[PDB]
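Following up on my earlier message about 2-acetamido-2-deoxy-beta-D-glucopyranose. Here are the inputs again, as you asked, copied directly from the submission form:
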Amino acid sequence: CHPRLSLHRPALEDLLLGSEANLTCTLTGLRDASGATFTWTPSSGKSAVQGPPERDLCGCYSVSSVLPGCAQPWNHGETFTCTAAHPELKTPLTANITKSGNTFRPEVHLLPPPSEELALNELVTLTCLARGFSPKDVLVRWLQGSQELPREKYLTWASRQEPSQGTTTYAVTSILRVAAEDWKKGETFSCMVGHEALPLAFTQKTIDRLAGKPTHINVSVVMAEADGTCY
Amino acid sequence: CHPRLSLHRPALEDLLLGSEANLTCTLTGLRGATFTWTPSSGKSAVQGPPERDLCGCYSVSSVLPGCAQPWNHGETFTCTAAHPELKTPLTANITKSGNTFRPEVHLLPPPSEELALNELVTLTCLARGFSPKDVLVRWLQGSQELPREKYLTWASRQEPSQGTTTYAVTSILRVAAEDWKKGETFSCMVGHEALPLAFTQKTIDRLAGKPTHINVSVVMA
Amino acid sequence: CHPRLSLHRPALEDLLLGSEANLTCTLTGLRDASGATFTWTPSSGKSAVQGPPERDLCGCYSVSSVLPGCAQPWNHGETFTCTAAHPELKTPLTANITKSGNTFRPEVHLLPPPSEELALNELVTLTCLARGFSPKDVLVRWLQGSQELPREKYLTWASRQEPSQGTTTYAVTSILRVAAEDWKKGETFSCMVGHEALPLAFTQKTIDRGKPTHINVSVVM
Ligand SMILES: *[C@@H]1O[C@H](CO)[C@@H](O)[C@H](O)[C@H]1NC(C)=O
Ligand SMILES: *[C@@H]1O[C@H](CO)[C@@H](O)[C@H](O)[C@H]1NC(C)=O
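Thanks, got it. Here's what our run produced:
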C-alpha cells in the first residue's frame, strides 16, 4: 500500500541512566526496496547506518536509519529534521521533532497494604502511583532496603491519559508482592520514579510497617528550661 | 493477501448485564461466502454488511445470536466457513473456560500528602488474582452510578508468579475535597465470571483510615 | 366460587441470575375434561409447552402452561396476553401483564451488635434492614469474608408494607447469628440485597469489629 515516514524521540532510559542517545527515522509502506538516502541538518559525525529491512503487513518493505550522539543538543532544545527520497513515490517526504515545552512533574504516592491482607499472613502488596505529568514517558524501579530488586518481580502498567480538569496529564501504576514476615520484621521498601521534568531526574518515596495504617501514635515532647534568660 | 478466520467469546458487558450475547465468526479474504455452526439452533446467523481494512483483504463476518444459556451450561460451538479463493473449508471452535479463580478487591484510602492542597482527592481500586482475563470496573457515589468519562481504568495484565497464571487491574477516581469533607461515600464494583453473584462491592468514606488511639506526653523539666 | 384464571410475573431469582425466564398462566377450580390448550399472543419461535395436569386437593386439578424465553421483551416493556380453551369455560377471557413503572431504589443498613449480649460472650445477632422500594420483590443473601454462606444458617421475613407520607413502599429484615470467637478476632461479614430498580442489580454492606478514637494527653512537671 502507499508509503509513510515518521520520526521518533530517543528512549527515556538511555537519556537518564545512560550516555548514548540515538534518534531514528523510519520509512514504511515501501513496495520492494530502494537505494535511498536520508538528510540530517547537524552532521558532525552522522554515520547514519541502515541495516536490514523488515517485513510488514501482507508484504511491505520497512527500512530505517539511526543517528548517534545527540544527547546534549536534545537537552539544549535544538531541532532535528529528516528527509528521504526513493524510487516508489513522486516527491521526497519530510518530518521534524523537538524536545517538549510546557511540561509538569509527577506527584508520587506509595500506599500501605490493605487491612485484610495482614491477617492471612502469607503475602502482602504495595502500590505506587504517579500522577499529573505532561509527557507520557516514565520509569518505575523498586528497592528492598537499599538494594534494587530484579525487574521480573513486579508489574507495571502503561501511561494513560486521565480525565481533564484543565491541561492534559497522564498517570501510571505498579504493584509489588513481598513476604509477610519481612513486613513484620521492619524491613523498608522504596519506589523510584524518573521523569524528564524532575530536577535531578529521579525522586523516591519510602514506607514500612510503622508508617501506614499505624493503629498507634506515640509521641513524647521534652522541653528542658522554659524559664532561662534567653540571650 | 492471506486468508484467516477466528471466533470470539461473547462480551462480558452483555453476559453480565443484559442477556443479548452474540458470537462472532470473522474472516479476512477476497484477495459471497457461507457459514455453518454445529448447533443449528433454528435461528440462523446474519452475514456482515463486508468492510475492508489496511489495504488488504475485504473482510466479512457473521454473527450467531442467542447464546446466553448454552454458553453458561458448557456446550461447544464450531464455525466452518467456505470461499472460492480457499483450498479447503476452514474451521475453529470455542468453549467456556475451565479452572477459573475469583478476584480479591481492595479500596485504598487517599494519601496524607494530598489533603493539604484542597483541590481533589484520589481513590484507588485494585483487583488481583483472577484466571480468565475479562473483568468490569464501575464506580458509584452513594447510589448513583457515575458516567464512564469521569474515571480511568487500565488494562488487565498478567502478574509475575510461578504457581499458576493469574491477572490484575487497577482504576482511579478523583473527587472534590469539599465532598470528601462533608462525609459522602464512594464505591467500587467489579464483575467477573467466577463470582457466584457476579459482582462485589467495597465502600469508603472519610473515617476508618483514622488511627485507633493517640498518646501525647509533654514533659516540662 | 368460580373456576378462576390468573397470570403471574417472572421470578426474581432466575431473572437476576440472567440465564432464563418463565411466565405461567393458570386455570384451576374444577376437574373437567383435560382439553386444556392455551393461546399466547407472542411466540419467539418456541411456543408454550403445558406440563401435566398437576393434582391438588378435593378435585381442584389445575391446568397451566408456561412459555420460556421471556427475558428481552419483558425487560424492554412488552405486553403479554394469555387465553385458554377447555370445554367447561365456553367464554374465555383476556389476561394482560406489564412491567411495572415508577420504581424506587432501596436503602440498606447493617447494624452492629447491643452490648447486652456482647457481655455474655456466647453469640451475637446481626440485622440487615431494607426499606423504601416500589415492588414487593427482594433477594437477601449473606457472606463472610469473600465466601458465600448456605441459605440454612439464617432466617428472613417477608415484605410488609410500611405506612408513610403519600406513596406505598416496603421493607424486609433478616437475622444472622455467628460465633463470638472470630468476631472478637476480627472476621468480617456482609449482607447483599437484590432488586430490579438498582443499576447493577445488587448492593452490599459490610461490618467489622464504629469505635471512636481514644486520646491520652499527659503533662509532667
Ligand atoms: C515541523 O513540521 C510541521 C508539520 O507537521 C510544520 O508545520 C512546522 O512548521 C515544522 N517546523 C519546523 C521548525 O520545521
Ligand atoms: C476444539 O478445540 C480444541 C481446543 O480448544 C481443539 O484441540 C480441537 O481440535 C477442536 N475440535 C474438535 C474437538 O473437533
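One observation from looking it over: The radius of gyration of chain A is 26 Å. Hope that helps, and feel free to reply on this thread.
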